[PDB]
């Protein structure tokens, strides 16, 4: 094993970076962008369709989740598959699924029909990662290949600022209707479909075949690459002397046992501390990651809260006789009103409450409220013509010879840009911490880096307190993203290099699956912390960042090494 | 299906007063707008009193509010209707409804489930 990896190292070595690694960064920075897209459709989505598809806070979490939940199923999945398979046609499998899906998660009306929808998609795009760092890995020699798996990161990035792009571009022109959003869904699902556009045109990788016992498909690969770099570098004379390489129902019970075997060789003697050390480290960071970036929004909505409860005007004492009203109200508090003979068309609220009011022969007509609520009134003799107030309005009332007429129809639930500006400043906050990992990795190091972009978040962490106005949350946000990137660049170059070829693509799927299974354990935890001391999320993340720290240092290097 | 019954009527007299209990089953039974109907000999089901899904607003029809009272406890899972100077004009049996609905309503056929109905003299 250890002499066919110095074998292959010289062939790439010798060629040199040409035309066909810089094709293959391409066309796998398009899936990359592909994954990025898909992790902000659902969270930009729920503003707007939570009216026409009459969802809850629960169906509201069930969303956000079942994302993350696909996206573990399918990392696992792939990256067992792939192994046994490929990398190329796994990869265009699980694509062609994520595209399909995501393209009939548009045209659908249902809530269950579309979790199921989002489901699948999240399935199919879990094996992008996985595959593709794996894939991208064999064509680069030990020369540089910290700092070139690192730019391949930079295209997550790219397919945020496309989501948040297409969100801002598309969502609030709520007038088009049916509604935009499904136009948003559909606009997002191409990145995808240009993944499988572009991948169709790329040879499998030469250490699969050569694993796989299948020498001569692995020769004319490396002769196609070999061929491709030489079209254009310096040197275009020199032919490809390399001979050959070093050699070395039933089906789908043949492939469950080859996954099965695959996946319990990497718990073995040799591989036992490496594979407990960054079960910890993936798990560890991923907690803390998602919990943060799930719990910054939420505190910038809370802060807005408040600031609109403090922005409230009330207005008591109220009579009123013989008049008629049609005009709009917004956050206010009506408090000990008399009302009697008025008439109300055509009038909208939101946010507004009447508490101890009297409505004697009034009458209502077209009338929609949001949040709005009857605490301790009475009314009699009043006439409710194709309104939307419903039973659960009227809290500690009275009514007496009243009746509702033309009730109107919708979803009963009463909950009928900030975000996505937010979420493009983090998006683009992550660029000096990928430039710099990028540049330093080979240098640095691999157990360096992480290590110190680690300790770093750990400390940055506890100046949370330190920001409490709705601007200083963002500046917090920003600085905690462009600085643990790096963390996970490293982490990535480093599950790379452990695992030999044989297991590379299974090492890094069952540890990127426990990423998905951390972060949603991660974000149900954070998501309840509001509303109680600041002092606990500061805690469980440095707690958290810690313990990776400490297991990071403790695994092996991996600097300048044959790729075993 | 809830499953609704009514209890504590019986001959009372004039200018008395007497409450009825009714009682559901099941664990939904927060999901209802709870109502009370009397039917007097000859005439139709005339809608009495209603309360709201959480007990805190009440629903009373032409002439019923003062003499009739109606509150619901959902803790103990039933509904009650206190009335109070009962004249010989209240002779019916009065019959407890439930509605899934989310606006009030006094139509009969607006109502889903029904109760078994109990005879006030």
């Known amino acids: 094993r250890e002499e066919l990896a110095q074998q292959y190292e010289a062939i790439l070595r010798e060629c040199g970076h040409g035309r066909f690694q810089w094709t293959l960064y391409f066309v796998l920075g398009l899936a990359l962008m592909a994954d990025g897209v898909e992790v902000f459709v659902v969270g930009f989505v729920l503003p707007s369709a939570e009216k026409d598809m009459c969802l809850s806070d629960s169906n509201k979490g069930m969303l956000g989740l079942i994302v993350y939940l696909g996206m573990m199923v399918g990392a696992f999945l792939w990256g067992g598959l792939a192994d046994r398979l490929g990398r190329r046609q796994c990869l265009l499998i699980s694509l062609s699924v994520n595209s399909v899906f995501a393209f009939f998660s548009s045209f659908v009306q249902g809530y269950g029909t579309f979790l199921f929808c989002r489901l699948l998609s999240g399935v199919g795009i879990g094996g992008s990662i996985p595959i593709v760092f794996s894939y991208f890995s064999e064509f680069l020699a030990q020369e540089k290949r910290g700092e070139h798996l690192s730019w391949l990161c930079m295209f997550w990035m790219i397919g945020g600022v496309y989501a948040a792009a297409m969100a801002w571009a598309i969502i609030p022109h709520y007038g088009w209707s049916f509604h935009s959003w499904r136009v948003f869904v559909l606009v997002c699902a191409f990145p995808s479909v240009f993944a499988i556009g572009a991948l169709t045109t790329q040879p499998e990788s030469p250490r699969f075949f050569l694993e796989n016992g299948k020498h001569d498909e692995a020769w004319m690969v490396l002769k196609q690459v070999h061929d491709t770099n030489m079209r254009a570098k310096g040197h275009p004379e020199r032919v490809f002397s390399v001979t050959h390489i070093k050699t070395i129902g039933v089906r789908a019970l043949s492939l469950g046992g080859q996954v099965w075997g695959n996946f319990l060789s990497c718990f073995g003697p040799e591989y036992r501390r490496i594979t407990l050390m960054m079960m910890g480290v993936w798990f560890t960071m991923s907690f803390s990651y998602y919990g943060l970036t799930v719990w910054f929004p939420d505190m910038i909505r809370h802060l807005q809260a408040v600031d609109y409860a403090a922005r409230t005007k009330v207005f008591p004492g109220e009579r009123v006789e013989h008049v008629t009203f049609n005009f709009t109200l917004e956050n206010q508090i009506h408090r000990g009103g008399q009302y009697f003979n008025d008439k109300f068309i055509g009038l909208r609220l939101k946010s507004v409450s009447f508490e101890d009011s009297l409505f004697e022969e009034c009458y209502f007509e077209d009338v929609t409220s949001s949040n709005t609520f009857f605490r301790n009134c009475t009314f009699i003799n009043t006439v409710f013509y194709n309104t939307d107030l419903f039973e659960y309005k009227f809290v500690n009332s009275r009514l007496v010879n009243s009746t509702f007429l033309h009730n109107k129809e919708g979803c009963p639930l009463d909950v009928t840009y900030m975000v996505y500006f937010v979420s493009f400043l983090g998006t683009l906050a992550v660029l000096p911490g990928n430039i710099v990992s990028a540049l330093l990795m080979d240098k640095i190091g691999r157990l360096r880096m992480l290590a110190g972009s680690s300790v770093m978040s750990c400390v940055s962490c506890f100046f949370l307190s330190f920001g409490n106005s709705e601007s200083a949350m963002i500046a917090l946000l920003c600085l905690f993203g462009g600085v643990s990137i790096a963390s996970w660049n490293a982490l990535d170059v480093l599950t790379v290099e452990l695992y030999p070829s044989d297991k590379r693509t299974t090492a890094f799927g069952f540890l990127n699956a426990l990423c998905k299974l951390a972060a949603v354990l991660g974000i149900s935890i954070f998501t309840s912390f509001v509303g109680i001391t600041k002092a606990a999320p500061i805690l469980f993340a440095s707690a958290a960042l810690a313990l990776g720290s400490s297991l990071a240092l403790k695994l092996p290097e991996t600097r300048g090494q044959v790729l075993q | 299906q809830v499953q609704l019954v009514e209890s504590g009527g019986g001959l009372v007299q004039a200018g008395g007063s007497l409450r009825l209990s009714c009682a559901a089953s099941?664990?939904?039974?927060?999901?209802?707008?709870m109502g009370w109907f009397r039917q007097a000999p000859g005439k139709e089901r005339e809608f009495v009193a209603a309360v709201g899904k959480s007990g805190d607003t009440t629903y009373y029809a032409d002439s019923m509010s003062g003499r009739f009272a109606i509150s619901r406890d959902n803790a103990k899972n039933t509904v009650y209707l206190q009335m109070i100077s009962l004249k010989p004009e209240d002779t019916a049996v009065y019959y407890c409804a439930a509605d899934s609905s989310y606006f009030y309503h006094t139509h009969e056929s607006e109502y889903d489930y029904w109760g078994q109905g109990t005879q006030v003299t």
């Open positions: 099941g664990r939904t039974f927060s999901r209802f707008i």
